[model samples]
Target chain A: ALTKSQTDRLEVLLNPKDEISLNSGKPFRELESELLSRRKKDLQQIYAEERENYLGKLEREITRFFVDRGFLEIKSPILIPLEYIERMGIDNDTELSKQIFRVDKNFCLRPMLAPNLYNYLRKLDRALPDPIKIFEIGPCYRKESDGKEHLEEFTMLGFQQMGSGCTRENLESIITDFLNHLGIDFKIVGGDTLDVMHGDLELSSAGVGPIPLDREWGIDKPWIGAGFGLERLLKVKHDFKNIKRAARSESYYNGISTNL
Target chain B: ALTKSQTDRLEVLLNPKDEISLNSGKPFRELESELLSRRKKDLQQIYAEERENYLGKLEREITRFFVDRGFLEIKSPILIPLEYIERMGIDNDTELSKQIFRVDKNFCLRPMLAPNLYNYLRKLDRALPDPIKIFEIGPCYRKESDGKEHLEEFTMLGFQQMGSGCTRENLESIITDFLNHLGIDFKIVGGDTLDVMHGDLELSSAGVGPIPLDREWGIDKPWIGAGFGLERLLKVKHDFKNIKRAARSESYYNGISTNL
Candidate 1:
């Protein structure tokens, strides 16, 4: 039993001249043909042309800042020996350990850049110069099943200066100068001995001078370290509620998804 | 076990002077440990410092090339759900499947970037475009344990042009133009239906458009796709016997070793 009006409205989608229109309605599914003639405008079905990665722009900018300031940029493999991570004592026993994406029995992809840095520094031998400033921008993985703010594989722009010249205020300078460079904000409050905060995100952290982990690495001098995520930076910059738009996967071109 | 001249030579190492020199001799390991005070100058421990990660530089250049030419650089989490990989028809039954670094029972770190690319393109119900150009460059792990020719965690640079107008010529352009930019001699010969050869290595591989994997994901139109390994590029470029210097886990700096 079909009303003539209903049939005419259903024909609007395929046959449009001056355009006959209908009230929005539910979508039909298999075995339920009643809703087939009714179509709602769920703009959720689409957006258009996402043609840029602004976060990448921020990454290159940040990398240039580090390079301009004399921090040697380096790259390391994601996979590292488990013992290297365990030497920090966050092995298979704790929650941090559970977050790690373990690859196999003897090796797991490095959860943090610190261990590999320490290994390289240690092997670099005592003859190396003091206050070694190095940085790496790469992705780090976690089991992160939390809210949209957490990404399982997230980009980390990590930098550290380890040597006799490190200071408690050094990490602050490191964090502030880069954030200031991004032109995002000028507000930061001390989060802890190893953290500095801006708005809802604790964007960076450091162990003022040398810490116990560095001690374990046989590095006793002062050191400062911090890692910043570009996604959080973009989110705060654009005031977007969802981080996906600011990151690698999104329907938005300039963080604005277009739908008609 | 020492003659006067030998004893004199060994003593010279312990008690060095401008006038003192030792004959070329192999010192004993134990006893008369005074010779233990001597260091062999460790020439066996040295090489040149590596000046570049042609790998990272190449990666950024290729990424920029795509972006400048209208390709979206989408970031996908490397920890792909296992079923997605199996759905592509590369499963544990094959040697290719065994190369994957399985993270857990339900998820495995992606051995190749194509599966995630497939999953994302399948979901882009966006109704506005044809010929979606995209790219990704990151480390993908395998059991690649041969020699300098292979790395268990190698960097992969991947790109695809997905839609009706893509072509094999597009794939060739992506491969050759970039190698030319790096100042590396380029001689590529296609090895079959889909692989490009460089020296003894299958440096890059591609297909014209419309592959079965794309079909499995419901993409009926043609696409141009290929992946290049950074180390292979550097290895052939430098004629180096080992590839470690250009990658992570190197004891050398600027491709040179320093221990005195």
Candidate 2:
């Protein structure tokens, strides 16, 4: 935080071409002082230890939950060839071709694990044991526009089954059971129902006046049962816990501040 | 799996300009019928459920291991902005940048989860908690000249720690413990010592000749360990079990067969 005059002067300095009088030497010093103070505050906010613990606990819980259910852990390759994407028919219309780094051979950081999982399928041709449940936790990379919520890379948890007779119902049951084990209360939303909700005039046009929109076609198509965003879930938890802050923490604040 | 004559004829058909002809005679019919039978056998090989099951089991095991370790499971966005990559100093020179799937928004699939995890760190201001261990398992893409071992897309496991006061040694201990738990009899080979052994020709390089030449350079670095290519591990496990004719009943293979 800076005094109004200090902030004004700093802003001008940041925009070099802007005409501003440097005659106000006193304000310049104040700006420098304010900047240093802000930096210190920022440093304090970035207390790495606390963040690490939180992530560790989360990891432990997740891993244990799956392992108890007889899932085998695996690690896959991070670099993949391009043919899988082509086969998957992923949209690649952007100038991303130039962004990938090539060695004597071309290689790119993995964006996801599904394709690699498919490759693994090709390799284990007739040597796999039944009821195979597999899970992996790994890094994924991508290029994106900069923003508070946007990052160039992130982690993902992907699991696949070979047999176990884990149908869609079984999958949902597993998810539900896991949540129950964690003592988390959640409501299941069917995909068809969600589609209907999305198409409803009351929901879709809540903020705006009812606008002409087509009814959602094929609302009855089967899809994976439930999905939700972590941030939204966190927000709900915060609300349940009666946390007073409008935002989560300093990191969110800093991102918001920088953007502002 | 065509008969020799049928294969030749098909090859000619593929290359229309080739000076080849399909003879319209009784012998041609017999050859065609034999070719069809061979083709069915080949297709059966291609559709072997055992292979799919092996892969699924591998994938499941990888995911479960991390989940058991108390890691916060997450799915990061596949597309990231270029500015973030530039900021990370991982531009086109790295394999990640090369294989990104460019889209309308100049987005690429994630190559690794570190940068995104960093973003989360920045947002959380390191305030989440202590011993923050996180893991993600997902797809990665790369561009390379194709080969049996090479793939354009693949799976990977990514893990990171921000706190917990666990040194590199501690991390290695954890990994070794896990491997032992899984019944893998592994010897801790110090990269530096291995280099010395190889240089002096004291150890046979027969099977280990392909060890990365630079593995010894990072001997003193504070890093734990990493592994990939689980197929080999599966092969070893299969041998130990002494089950012949491939374990075709594995869960992963059946899952793929039924599209689970």
Candidate 3:
């Protein structure tokens, strides 16, 4: 019988998802020795490849795209009043609202950055001049139920523009230019929730606003908002087997699982 | 009686921790109206203050602190194996181990950044020259039972230096220069766990090593490592009432609670 330490190590050494074809009558110690040798080989390869993180590289390029082009980066609050959820048309009775992790009676971790972005749009629109271009890249929380891809807390990159030259055409062109800047070929699919797709992977969901929801926040100006799940972008761009590899985790470094 | 919506708004508008004195004979509606007016005034004040986040500002300054120096910034894995915990002298039976949020039979969200840093130290030491200066700023997870000052997920800035120049004196001056760079005054106190203090607040816990644990990681050269809770740095420096106000959350931005 294998010791608990040996078994735990085997669990990490063997990719549980991959099929194993071991000799039916091999000695247990011999098999363990072979697996340990394989683990040694794995470590050397991973270490050689672990130079810099791909996620940070992606973020810097994206940030430079905005910052170099005059987009002011804004850090919005992660915990927000439930009223903003209501303002976004997600009532307490809704399924989406149910997914929210409530911190207290009035506050919940923000499921999305749009509400705060909208608030900023309202405030900045009044305070600043026309062309209020801003971007926020931070973690957003959601209580996801059993999904290989979804994270309870994921990084979101949100960019919004309000004022002159904000249009559906401009929004589409800007997203195209941004994706093109990263050198990832994408297909813009048509829908109310306009999604940018790299094959089946949805890179981003964007929409031009001044919809009915705008009135709820007392904003009447035309604005365009786009939200990108940064992990999804990295996953699709780098062809990661699991989205978690591209996310904020200690289990993986630079998209490679670190246990070995 | 106030409606649930109105009551919810009031809950956000008023700071529950603060004492309120109402007229002994004032009508309930009059009080509600006065509170509503107070809420409006609070919004205006917070709006004026809502320019950028203090957390991001601190991070940028800290990142500059390392980048401007010849330090390399490495993103260590967030999910780590339990063996590293054991290597750090923390067994499953320990109190700190109980606080760890285990993900599976092998891995848990990293409770601290040191184990990963130590792993990097081992890897980078063999490949690079002496004086390998590296820093990482990222979120760390821990399940705190109760503390107004702790977050389940908080940002940590872990920095380690290995090589010829790594010494106790150099570590002290570097930390002093860091705090001084941020325009913060700190006091270093005596103990095995050398704590950097800002008056009553502990800014960091640091140590020089080649200790017993160094053997566990195959590290023998003298090294100095410091782990600072970035939120604590913000809290004491800015006089934030609650540490959560300095954390990554949608409820607060730029150290101000957002409900109002």
Q: List candidate 3 segments past 4 Å from native.
A: A1-54, A57-135, A139-154, A160-167, A180-185, A199-201, A208-224, A229-260, B1-51, B92-95, B104-106, B145-148
lDDT of 2 by residue, A17-111 (tens): 22444445555676555544454454344432221222223444555666667654444555556654444445557444434332224455655
What are the clashing pairs of model 1? A194-A206, A209-A223, B48-B255, B48-B256, B49-B254, B49-B255, B49-B256, B50-B254, B50-B255, B50-B256
Off by over 4 Å in 1: A1-51, A91-94, A125-128, A246-260, B1-54, B120-128, B250-254, B257-260
> By DockQ thresholds, what CAPRI class is model 2?
incorrect
Q: Judge candidate 2 at residue A107 and give its lDDT.
A: 52
Which digits, one per residue and each the tens of the lDDT, describe model 3 over residues B1-260?
55677555544444433455543455567766666555545444543444345666677668767766756567655656877788889986787877776644776667898887887777655445567777888777776866767887788999988878877888898899998988788999861358898877778889887788788887888888799998888877776767876776655554544443
DockQ of predicted candidate 1: 0.24
Name the TM-score of candidate 1. 0.75
lDDT of 1 by residue, B1-260 (tens): 55777564444334222233243453543423433322322211221222223555667677777777777676666667788777879866888787777877898777788876665555443433566667777777778667877877777878877776576666777777877776666556651246667656787777665666667876776678788887777667765556664566545443433222
- Chain B TM-score, one value per candidate, order as shown: 0.73, 0.52, 0.81
Better of 1 and 2 by TM-score: 1
| Span of 10 residues, lowest total lDDT, candidate 2 chain A | A201-210
DockQ of each: 0.24, 0.06, 0.13
Error of 3 at A245 (Å): 8.3
RMSD of each: 9.8, 14.3, 9.2
